[PDB]
């Protein structure tokens, strides 16, 4: 729930502001977990070197890079196969630091998403700066935490968690009611965990 | 910090008890993150279909399986390449349910660990029951949470979190002082997060 700003407004933020660019790669998923639970969509995130879940991407120094080229530089290191353009640009948000966080997002086919996972495990940053990709489970199991709420209970780069829920909403992959519900089950799971 | 019990004591627990078997695959890692931070060891865990971090493995029905064969059944589905024996058996612990959790652990070479990651992304359960492998960062960064404490802040299968810290200790991959320290930085990070 960051403050959204227009693309052109973000580009007037220069030296005072650092810029980050991240990629949300996702695919329609017709499969069913256990033959029973529709998966609907699969979204890629990653375990970062700092032990947090985030999106592929990183900080882009505008002294040296366009946002596109700087993003693809980092995607080349950590995913090693795909390149995004301004066609995929989705949002800019304001955030310790003054950072404008840009989100790019692209719908892939499910096998294209799998190809990204296969190239990631051979990438230059795999095992160093990137410690593995994970798929976001977007379903919720019968106990009401299995799946997406449990997943939201992990530790994120805060801007990544905000961007994921923002994108799921504006891309109409999940209604905002269900996002608020899942976030609420996660936070209460977390508070119920802190009882020891 | 589960109650440890002897192998033979666990085998006297039959029908009243469910049994789980998990694999801790790890490797000495001579590399340095950013050229600066010794990585020491790499441990494999995975994002499970329920949105929690855990170890490769699962529940083993002793009506049908030995613990070894049942473990390798699940490893075959989710990792697709390696098989463990009783030579790798490390511990049994008592835990909603009456479960004896058995931990197997094997030191691999770093490239053998990478081969496991490559076979996992082609496995039968990848994208369904297993949503991706991740490496555990065992270093701590200068801010005292980057790396291992942040990683411990994620959401685990509780038995998996206990088994990881138990194994790091008894395998002498990390002194217990440092484990308690990292767990303490994680829990306080979590509590400081629940302020919103």
């Amino acid at each position, epitope marked *: 729930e960051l403050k959204q700003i227009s693309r052109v407004e973000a580009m007037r933020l220069g030296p005072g502001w650092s810029h980050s660019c991240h990629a949300m790669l996702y695919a329609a998923n017709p499969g069913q977990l256990f033959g029973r639970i529709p998966m609907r969509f699969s979204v890629l995130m990653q375990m970062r*070197f700092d032990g947090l879940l985030g999106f592929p991407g990183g*900080f882009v120094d505008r*002294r040296f890079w366009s946002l596109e080229d700087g993003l693809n*530089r980092v995607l080349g290191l950590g995913l090693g196969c795909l390149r995004l353009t301004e066609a995929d640009y989705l949002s800019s948000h304001l955030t310790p630091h003054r950072v404008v966080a840009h989100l790019y997002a692209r719908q892939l086919t499910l096998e294209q998403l799998h190809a990204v996972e296969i190239s990631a495990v051979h990438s230059r940053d795999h095992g*160093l700066e990137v410690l593995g990709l994970v798929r976001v489970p977007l379903y919720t199991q019968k106990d009401r935490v299995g799946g997406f709420p449990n997943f939201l209970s992990n530790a994120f780069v805060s801007t990544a968690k905000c961007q994921l829920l923002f994108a799921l909403k504006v891309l109409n992959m999940m209604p905002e009611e269900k996002l608020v519900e899942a976030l609420a089950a996660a936070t209460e799971k977390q508070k119920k965990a802190l009882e020891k | 910090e589960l109650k440890q019990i002897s192998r033979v004591e666990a085998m006297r627990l039959g029908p009243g008890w469910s049994h789980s078997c998990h694999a801790m695959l790890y490797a000495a890692n001579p590399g340095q993150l950013f*050229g*600066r931070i010794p990585m020491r060891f790499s441990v494999l865990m995975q994002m499970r279909f329920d949105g929690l971090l855990g170890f490769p493995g699962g529940f083993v029905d002793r009506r049908f399986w030995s613990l070894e064969d049942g473990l390798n059944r699940v490893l075959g589905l989710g990792l697709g390449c390696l098989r463990l024996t009783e030579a790798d058996y490390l511990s049994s612990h008592l835990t909603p349910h009456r479960v004896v959790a058995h931990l197997y652990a094997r030191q691999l070479t770093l490239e053998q660990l990478h081969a496991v990651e490559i076979s996992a992304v082609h496995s039968r359960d990848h994208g369904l029951e297993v949503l991706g492998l991740v490496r555990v960062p065992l270093y701590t960064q200068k801010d005292r949470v980057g790396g291992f404490p942040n990683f411990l802040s994620n959401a685990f299968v509780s038995t998996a979190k206990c088994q990881l810290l138990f194994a790091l200790k008894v395998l002498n991959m990390m002194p217990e002082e440092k484990l308690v320290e990292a767990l303490a930085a994680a829990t306080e990070k979590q509590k400081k997060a629940l302020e919103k």
Partner: nanobody
Amino acid sequence: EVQLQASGGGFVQPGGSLRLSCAASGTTSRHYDMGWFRQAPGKEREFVSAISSDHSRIPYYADSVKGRFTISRDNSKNTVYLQMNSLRAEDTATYYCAYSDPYQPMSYWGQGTQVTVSS
């Protein structure tokens, strides 16, 4: 904190040559970018050249220095070099080394080194 240390510069006769060096210390990364800016009399600080540590792309140059300046690196020393040839009066300026990388937000600047081209 990434600290930048620079070497070289000073007085140069027109058409001569001069080589700047710059290294990064501290919380550096493995994949990073380093380059040079300069501020000439009555102008704003302008891009000169940049290079990457990882062959991510080809080093680039300002149009006014193409074919005269060449940037190069030694990532065993985390050091980059600017070889300035066929120096002209237009090249008189304070030159600044820069460092950044994809894994931390800060864009770092070194201290200015004066290059003075004059007969």
